[PDB]
Ligand binder design. Structure first.
Ligand code: CLA
Ligand code: CLA
Ligand code: CLA
Ligand code: CLA
Ligand code: CLA
Ligand code: CLA
Ligand code: CLA
Ligand code: CLA
Ligand SMILES: CC1=C(/C=C/C(C)=C/C=C/C(C)=C/C=C/C=C(C)/C=C/C=C(C)/C=C/C2=C(C)CCCC2(C)C)C(C)(C)CCC1
Ligand SMILES: CC1=C(/C=C/C(C)=C/C=C/C(C)=C\C=C\C=C(C)\C=C\C=C(C)\C=C\C2=C(C)CCCC2(C)C)C(C)(C)CCC1
Ligand code: SF4
Ligand code: SF4
Lengths: 112, 119, 79, 184, 218, 86, 73
C-alpha cells in the first residue's frame, strides 16, 4: 500500500500534469508548473486520486494552522510581556514579538 | 465702475457655453445621419467615389493609381524582357513572358475594397 | 478677497483692481466686429478644407488657370 | 568680488593648482571630526537613545542592550571622524572621484563588487557552456555547478584570454539578428 | 446539392422538427433582428446536447431544426454535433425576405476535406515576408494595403528597390520646360507613334548633354 | 470585413480550417506540398477575426495571416446578435 | 540524384521571418518531388513561440552550416 510512496517523483518536477511532461522548454513551463500545483482536477489519474489529494491537502493545511497557533503560543510564553499585561493590562501594550539588534533594527522595539 | 463688463458676460457666457454647445451637438447628431457623414474616413460614401472619379478625370492623374505607371515605352520593356527570358528559358519550357505576366497580375482577392458597392 | 497660501498672507501680497472700466463698450464692439470677420472667414475655410480640392473644375469652371512666372521657375529649378 | 553673492550662494575655488583636484580640498566639504552639524547630529542620536534607555529598569536586559547600542553609536561617531562631510549637513560623504586613498572612497567597493560580479557571471556562463541542454538547467548538475563556481575565481584573466582569442563573442551572422525590416 | 425549404422562424411556430430545448433569453432577439441562421441535421438517438444560446436540449430521433441569430452559433452547434458522430448537418442563412442561402457544407463536403473544383481564394504565391513594403505603394491602388498587392506588383516594386540603390548609374529626370511648352491642349501634333521617336531623340540629346557637361571637371 | 490571406508555405495541416468558428477557411487541392492541398479563405466576409487559425498554424511564420480592418467592420465581422444590419 | 542537403546535416536558416533566422538545425528529410516548393524539413533544439521545433524550408533557405558547438545556437 505505502510501498508506492516514493521520492522518485520529487526530482521529476511537473509530473502531476500531462501538459508539463514535454519538459521545461521555456520559462512559461515554470509558471504553469506553479499554476497547476493545486489544480487536482486537471492532474493525472482517476477521480479517487482527486479525493485523496483534496482531503490530505485539507489535513496538511490544518496542520499548518495548528503550527501557526503553536508559534503564537510559544511567543506568548517565552517572548512576551504577558505577565505584566496580566498584572496591569490598562498600562501595558501587548507584545509577544521582538526584533533582533541588527542593522539598528533595535529601533523597532519600543517601551511596552 | 470696475464692473459694467459683466453686461457682456451675462449674454456671452450663457450663449457660448450653453446655446452654441447644444446647437453644435444637435447639428452633429443630425450630420451623423447624412449619407455624406465622415466621408473622408468612413468607407463607402458617395462623395468619396465622386472625388476619386474626379481625380481620375484629370489628364495628369489618369494612370496615377497604377503601381506600374512610368514605363515610357512599355513595348520596349516587354520585348527586352521576352528576349532576356528566351536565352534563360529552361529546356523545353512552354511558358511565355506575356501569359506569365498576365497570370502574375491576375490574383484572386474578391474581398478587397468590396465596400465600393453601396454608395 | 480671502487670500490663501502662506506667502500671500505673510508678505501682504495684494491684487489691485482698477476703479475705472478698462475698455469702453465701443472698443469691445470694435473688437467684436473683427472677431465676427475672423469667424465668417474661418467658417468658409473650414468648408473649403472639408470639401477639399475639386480637380474636375477644368470641365466646368471658366478661365484657363494660371501658373505664376515664378512658380514655373520653381518647377524647373528642381525639387 | 565675493563670488558667494555673485552666484547666489555657491562659492568657487578661483585657484588653478593640481593640489586642489583632490576631494579633500573642496570648500563644500569638511572633516567630520571638526564639523558642528556632525557633532549636533550624533549628540542628538546619543540623547534620543539615552532617553529611551532611562525609560526601562536599571537591571533589565533592555538596559544592557541600550548600553551596547550607545557604545555602537559612539564608535560610529569616532570612526567617521576622518570621513568628509558637508559644511552644512554634517552627513559624511562618499568619494567617487577615483581617489583610492580617502575615507569613504568608492574605488574599493567598486573593485570588490566588480570582481565578485564577474565571478558570478563567469561561473554561470561556464555552466551554461558545459551543459548545453535544457534538462541540465532545471535539474542542476550540482558537482559541475560547484566546479564552475569554484573555477570562476580566475575570470579577469580567462575572460580576457577568451575575448582576444575569439572564444567569447560570436559573429552577428550566427545568431538571430532580429525581426525583418524589409523584403518586398 | 439541393437547398431545403427552411421557412422563416416567425412562420414555423410549433414544428415537429424542433428539438426539446429548455429555452432561455439567449435566443435570437426578435422585434429587432430579421436575419436568422438555421441548422438542420438528422440524428440516430435522442442524445442531450447544449444549445449555443444557453440551456440544454434533446435531439429528435429523426429530423432536427434550430434557429439562431448568428452563423457562429450554428457552426458551434455543428462542431458539437460532429463530435457526436453526426454528419449530414446543413447550415442555412435566412434573409429577411425568406430567401434561403446554403452556407456551411457549401459544396456538400466539409471544408477540412479536400474536394475537387475548389480554387485557392486569397492565395499569395510567396512566403509571408514576400509582401511589398507599404512605403513603396503610397497613393497607388494599395495605399495602405501592401498585403493586397498582386504578385506582379510585388516583383515590380522589388525590382525597383533593387534598382534604386545603385545611385551613380541612375538617370535624373530632365526638368520640364514649362515656359515654352504647355500650349492649349487643342494645339497638338497627333502622330502618337512619332511621339515616342521624339521621346527617344530628346532623351538622347539630354544624355549627350549630360555626358558632355560631366566630362569637364570629372 | 477582415482580410485572411493564405501563403505558399502552407503544408495542408487542415488545423486552420478546423479551428475557424465561422467556416471561413476551406481546403483546396494543390501541388506545392507533400499533402497536395493548401488552405483557402473564400468566405472572409464571415471572418470575425478571432485569429484561432493563426494560433493553429504550425509553420515557422503563419501560412495564414489575418489582417484586422476596424474601419471596415460589418455585422458579420462584429458578431452582432442584438442588432441586425440587413 | 539527391537534391538539397543530406539527411542529418546541419544547415543555417536564411529565411528572414523565421524564428530560427541565422540559427542552425538538423535536416530531418528533403522531399524529392520537384513540385514541392519548401521540401527541406529542419528540426531545431529551440522551440518557437508556438512550441514547434520543426519547420519546412525552401531549397534556397538552407546553406549547410557546420555543427553548432559548445554554447552556440
Ligand atoms: C479554501 C480556499 C481555497 C481553495 C481550496 C482553492 C483552491 C483552488 N483554487 Mg482558488 N481562490 C481562493 C481560495 C481557494 N482556492 C480565493 C479566496 C480566491 C480569490 C483570490 C481564489 C481565486 C482563484 C483563481 C482565480 C483560480 C483559483 C484556482 C484554484 C485551483 C488551483 C489553485 C492552484 O493551483 O494555485 C496554486 C497556488 C498558488 C499559485 C499560490 C501562489 C500565491 C498567491 C497567488 C499570492 C499570494 C501572495 C501572498 C498572500 C503575499 C506574500 C507576502 C509578501 C510580503 C511577500 C484550486 C482548486 C485556479 C484554477 O484553475 O482553479 C481550477 C484559478 O484560476 N482560485
Ligand atoms: C508559524 C508561525 C511562526 C512565525 C511567523 C514565527 C516567526 C518568528 N519566530 Mg518563531 N516559532 C514558531 C512559529 C513561528 N515563528 C514555533 C512553532 C516555535 C516553537 C518551535 C517557534 C520558536 C521560536 C523561537 C525560540 C524564536 C522564534 C523567533 C522568531 C522570529 C525570528 C525568527 C528567526 O530568527 O528566523 C529564523 C529563520 C530560520 C531558522 C530559517 C528557516 C520571527 C518573528 C525568534 C525571536 O523572536 O527572537 C527574538 C526566537 O528566538 N521562534
Ligand atoms: C536590509 C536590512 C535588513 C536585514 C539584514 C534584516 C534582517 C532581519 N530582520 Mg529585518 N527589517 C528591515 C531590514 C532588514 N532586516 C526593515 C527595513 C524593517 C522595517 C520594516 C525590518 C523589520 C523587521 C521586523 C519587524 C523583524 C525583522 C526581523 C529580521 C530577522 C529575521 C527575519 C525573519 O523573521 O525571518 C523569518 C523566517 C522564518 C519564519 C523561517 C521560515 C522558513 C520556512 C521555510 C518558511 C533578520 C535577521 C525579525 C526578527 O529580528 O525576529 C526577532 C522581526 O521580527 N525585521
Ligand atoms: C483664445 C480665445 C479666447 C478664449 C479662450 C476666451 C475665453 C473667455 N472669454 Mg473671451 N474674447 C476673446 C478671445 C477668447 N476668450 C476675444 C478675441 C475677444 C474680443 C472680441 C473676447 C471678448 C470677450 C468678452 C467681451 C467676454 C469674454 C468672456 C470670456 C470667458 C467666457 C467664455 C465666453 O463666453 O467667451 C465669449 C467670447 C467670444 C464669443 C469672443 C470670441 C472668442 C474667441 C475669439 C474664439 C476662439 C475659439 C478658439 C479658436 C477655439 C475654437 C475651438 C473650440 C471649439 C475648442 C472666457 C474666459 C466673457 C467673460 O466672462 O469674461 C470674463 C465676456 O464677457 N471674451
Ligand atoms: C455660431 C454660428 C455658426 C457656426 C459656428 C457655423 C459653423 C458651420 N456651419 Mg453653419 N449656419 C449658421 C451659423 C453658424 N455656422 C447660420 C446662422 C445658418 C443659417 C443661415 C447656418 C447654416 C448652415 C448650413 C445650411 C450648413 C452649415 C454648415 C456649417 C459647418 C461647415 C463647416 C464644415 O465643413 O464642417 C463639416 C462638418 C463637420 C466637421 C462635422 C462637425 C461639425 C458639427 C456639426 C459642429 C461642430 C462645432 C464644434 C463644437 C466647434 C460649420 C461647422 C454646413 C455643414 O456641414 O453642416 C454641418 C451646412 O450644410 N451651416
Ligand atoms: C569624467 C570623469 C572622471 C573620470 C573618468 C575620472 C577617472 C579617474 N580619476 Mg578622477 N576626478 C574627476 C573626474 C573623473 N575622474 C573629478 C571631477 C575630480 C575632481 C576635480 C577628480 C579628481 C581625481 C583625483 C584627485 C584622482 C583621480 C584619479 C582618477 C583615476 C583613478 C582610477 C584608477 O584606475 O586609478 C588607478 C581615473 C583615471 C586618481 C588618479 O590619478 O589615479 C590614476 C586620483 O588620485 N581623480
Ligand atoms: C553592495 C551593494 C550592491 C548590490 C546589491 C548591487 C546589485 C547589482 N548590481 Mg551593482 N555595484 C555596486 C554595489 C551593489 N550592486 C557598487 C558599489 C558598484 C560600483 C560603483 C556597482 C557596480 C555595478 C555595475 C557596473 C553593474 C552592477 C550591476 C548590478 C546588478 C546585477 C547583479 C550582478 O552583478 O549579477 C551578476 C553578473 C552578471 C549576471 C553579469 C556580469 C555583469 C557584471 C557587471 C560584470 C561585468 C565585468 C566587466 C568585465 C567590467 C564592466 C565594465 C563596465 C561595463 C562597468 C545588481 C542589481 C549590473 C547591472 O545592473 O546591470 C544591468 C552592472 O552592470 N553593479
Ligand atoms: C548581496 C548579494 C550577494 C553577495 C554579497 C554575494 C557574494 C558572493 N557570491 Mg553570490 N550570488 C548572488 C548574490 C550575492 N552573492 C545571487 C543573487 C546569485 C544568483 C542566484 C549569486 C550567484 C553566485 C554564484 C554562481 C557564485 C557566487 C559567488 C559568490 C562569492 C564570490 C567568491 C569570493 O569572493 O570568494 C568567497 C561571494 C561570497 C561565487 C562563489 O561562491 O565562488 C566559490 C560563485 O561561483 N554567487
Ligand atoms: C555585500 C556588499 C558588497 C557586495 C555586494 C554584491 C556582490 C552584491 C551582488 C548582488 C547581486 C548579484 C544582485 C543580483 C540582482 C539581480 C536582480 C535584482 C534581478 C533582477 C531582475 C529583473 C529586474 C527582471 C528584469 C526584467 C526581465 C526579466 C526581462 C524583461 C525586462 C524586466 C526588467 C522586467 C560590496 C563588497 C560590494 C560592498 C559592501 C556590501
Ligand atoms: C574611473 C571612474 C569613473 C569612470 C568610469 C568609466 C568612464 C568607466 C567606463 C567604462 C566603459 C567605457 C566600459 C566599456 C565596456 C565595453 C565593453 C564592450 C564591455 C564588455 C564586457 C563584457 C563583454 C563582459 C563579459 C563578461 C565577463 C568578462 C564576466 C561576466 C560574464 C560576461 C560574459 C558578461 C567614474 C566617473 C564613474 C567615477 C570615478 C571613477
Ligand atoms: S494551419 Fe497553416 S499550414 Fe496548416 S493547413 Fe492551415 S494555413 Fe496551411
Ligand atoms: S480569424 Fe477566426 S473566423 Fe477569421 S478565418 Fe481565422 S479562425 Fe476563422
Amino acid at each position: 500500500i505505502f510501498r508506492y510512496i516514493n521520492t522518485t517523483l520529487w526530482a521529476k518536477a511537473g509530473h502531476f500534469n500531462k501538459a508539463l511532461s514535454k519538459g521545461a522548454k521555456t520559462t512559461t513551463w515554470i509558471w504553469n508548473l506553479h499554476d497547476y500545483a493545486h489544480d487536482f482536477d486537471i492532474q493525472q489519474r482517476s477521480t479517487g486520486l482527486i479525493a485523496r489529494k483534496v482531503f490530505s491537502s485539507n489535513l496538511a493545511h490544518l496542520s499548518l494552522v495548528f503550527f501557526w497557533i503553536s508559534g503564537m503560543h510559544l511567543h506568548g510564553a517565552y517572548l512576551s510581556n504577558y505577565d505584566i499585561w496580566l498584572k496591569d493590562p490598562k498600562s501595558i501594550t501587548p507584545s509577544s514579538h521582538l526584533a533582533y539588534s541588527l542593522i539598528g533594527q533595535d529601533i523597532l522595539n519600543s517601551y511596552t | 465702475k470696475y464692473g459694467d463688463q459683466r453686461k457682456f458676460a451675462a449674454v456671452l457666457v450663457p450663449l457660448t457655453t450653453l446655446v452654441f454647445p447644444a446647437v453644435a451637438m444637435g447639428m452633429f447628431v443630425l450630420y451623423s445621419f447624412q449619407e455624406d457623414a465622415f466621408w473622408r474616413i468612413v468607407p463607402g460614401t458617395k462623395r468619396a467615389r465622386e472625388l476619386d472619379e474626379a481625380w481620375r478625370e484629370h489628364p495628369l492623374f489618369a494612370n496615377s493609381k497604377d503601381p506600374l505607371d512610368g514605363l515610357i515605352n512599355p513595348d520596349d520593356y516587354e520585348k527586352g524582357l521576352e528576349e532576356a527570358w528566351e536565352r534563360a528559358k529552361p529546356a523545353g519550357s512552354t511558358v511565355t513572358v506575356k501569359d506569365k505576366l498576365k497570370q502574375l497580375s491576375k490574383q484572386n482577392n474578391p474581398h478587397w475594397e468590396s465596400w465600393r458597392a453601396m454608395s | 478677497r480671502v487670500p490663501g497660501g502662506k506667502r500671500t498672507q505673510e508678505l501682504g501680497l495684494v491684487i489691485p483692481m482698477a476703479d475705472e472700466d478698462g475698455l469702453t463698450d465701443g472698443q469691445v464692439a470694435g473688437l467684436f466686429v473683427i472677431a465676427l470677420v475672423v469667424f465668417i472667414s474661418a467658417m468658409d475655410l473650414a468648408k473649403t478644407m472639408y470639401n477639399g480640392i475639386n480637380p474636375a473644375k477644368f470641365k466646368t469652371s471658366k478661365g484657363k488657370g494660371y501658373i505664376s512666372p515664378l512658380v514655373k521657375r520653381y518647377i524647373e529649378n528642381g525639387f | 568680488a565675493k563670488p558667494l553673492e555673485m552666484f547666489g550662494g555657491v562659492d568657487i575655488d578661483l585657484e588653478d593648482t593640481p593640489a586642489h583636484w583632490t576631494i579633500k580640498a573642496s570648500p563644500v566639504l569638511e572633516p567630520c571630526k571638526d564639523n558642528k552639524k556632525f557633532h549636533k547630529k550624533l549628540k542628538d542620536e546619543l540623547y534620543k537613545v539615552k532617553k529611551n534607555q532611562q525609560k526601562f529598569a536599571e537591571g533589565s536586559a533592555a538596559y544592557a542592550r541600550f548600553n551596547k547600542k550607545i557604545k555602537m553609536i559612539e564608535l560610529r561617531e569616532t570612526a567617521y571622524g576622518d570621513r568628509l562631510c558637508g559644511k552644512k549637513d554634517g552627513l559624511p560623504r562618499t568619494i567617487a572621484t577615483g581617489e583610492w586613498n580617502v575615507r569613504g572612497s568608492a574605488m574599493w567597493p567598486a573593485a570588490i563588487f566588480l570582481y565578485i560580479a564577474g565571478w558570478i557571471g563567469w561561473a554561470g556562463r561556464s555552466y551554461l557552456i558545459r551543459t548545453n541542454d535544457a534538462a541540465k538547467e532545471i535539474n542542476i548538475d550540482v558537482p559541475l555547478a560547484v566546479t564552475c563556481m569554484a573555477s570562476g575565481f580566475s575570470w579577469p584573466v580567462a575572460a580576457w584570454q577568451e575575448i582576444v582569442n575569439g572564444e567569447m563573442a560570436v559573429p552577428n551572422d550566427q545568431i538571430h539578428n532580429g525581426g525583418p525590416w524589409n523584403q518586398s | 446539392v439541393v437547398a431545403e425549404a427552411i421557412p422563416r422562424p416567425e412562420d414555423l411556430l410549433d414544428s415537429p422538427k424542433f428539438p426539446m430545448f429548455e429555452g432561455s433569453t439567449g435566443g435570437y432577439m426578435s422585434r429587432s433582428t430579421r436575419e436568422r441562421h438555421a441548422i438542420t441535421w438528422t440524428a440516430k438517438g435522442q442524445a442531450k446536447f447544449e444549445m449555443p444560446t444557453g440551456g440544454f436540449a434533446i435531439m429528435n430521433q429523426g429530423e432536427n431544426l434550430c434557429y439562431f441569430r448568428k452563423k457562429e452559433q450554428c457552426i458551434a452547434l455543428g462542431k458539437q454535433l460532429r463530435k457526436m458522430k453526426i454528419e449530414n448537418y446543413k447550415i442555412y442563412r435566412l434573409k429577411k425576405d425568406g430567401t434561403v442561402i446554403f452556407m456551411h457544407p457549401a459544396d456538400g463536403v466539409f471544408p477540412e476535406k479536400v474536394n475537387k473544383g475548389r480554387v485557392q481564394v486569397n492565395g499569395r504565391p510567396f512566403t509571408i515576408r514576400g509582401n511589398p513594403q507599404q512605403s513603396e505603394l503610397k497613393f497607388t491602388k494599395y495605399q495602405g494595403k501592401g498585403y493586397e498587392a498582386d504578385p506582379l506588383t510585388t516583383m515590380f516594386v522589388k525590382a525597383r528597390v533593387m534598382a534604386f540603390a545603385d545611385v551613380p548609374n541612375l538617370f535624373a529626370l530632365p526638368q520640364p520646360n514649362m515656359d515654352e511648352l504647355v500650349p492649349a491642349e487643342e494645339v497638338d501634333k497627333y502622330t502618337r507613334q512619332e511621339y515616342t521617336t521624339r521621346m527617344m531623340e530628346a532623351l538622347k540629346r539630354v544624355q549627350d548633354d549630360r555626358a558632355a557637361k560631366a566630362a569637364k571637371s570629372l | 470585413s477582415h482580410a485572411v490571406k493564405i501563403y505558399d508555405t502552407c503544408i495542408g495541416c487542415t488545423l486552420c480550417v478546423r479551428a475557424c468558428p465561422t467556416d471561413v477557411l476551406e481546403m483546396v487541392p494543390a501541388s506545392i506540398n507533400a499533402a497536395k492541398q493548401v488552405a483557402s479563405s473564400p468566405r472572409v466576409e464571415d471572418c470575425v477575426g478571432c485569429k484561432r487559425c493563426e494560433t493553429a498554424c504550425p509553420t515557422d511564420f503563419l501560412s495564414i495571416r489575418v489582417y484586422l480592418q476596424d474601419n471596415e467592420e460589418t455585422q458579420y465581422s462584429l458578431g452582432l446578435d442584438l442588432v441586425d444590419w440587413s | 540524384p539527391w537534391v538539397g542537403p543530406k539527411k542529418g546535416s546541419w544547415v543555417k536558416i536564411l529565411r528572414p521571418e523565421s524564428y530560427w533566422f541565422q540559427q542552425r538545425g538538423q535536416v530531418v528529410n528533403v522531399n524529392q518531388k520537384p513540385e514541392v516548393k519548401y521540401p527541406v524539413t529542419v528540426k531545431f533544439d529551440s522551440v518557437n513561440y508556438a512550441n514547434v521545433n520543426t519547420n519546412g524550408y525552401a531549397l534556397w533557405e538552407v546553406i549547410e552550416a557546420p555543427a553548432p558547438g559548445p554554447g552556440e545556437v
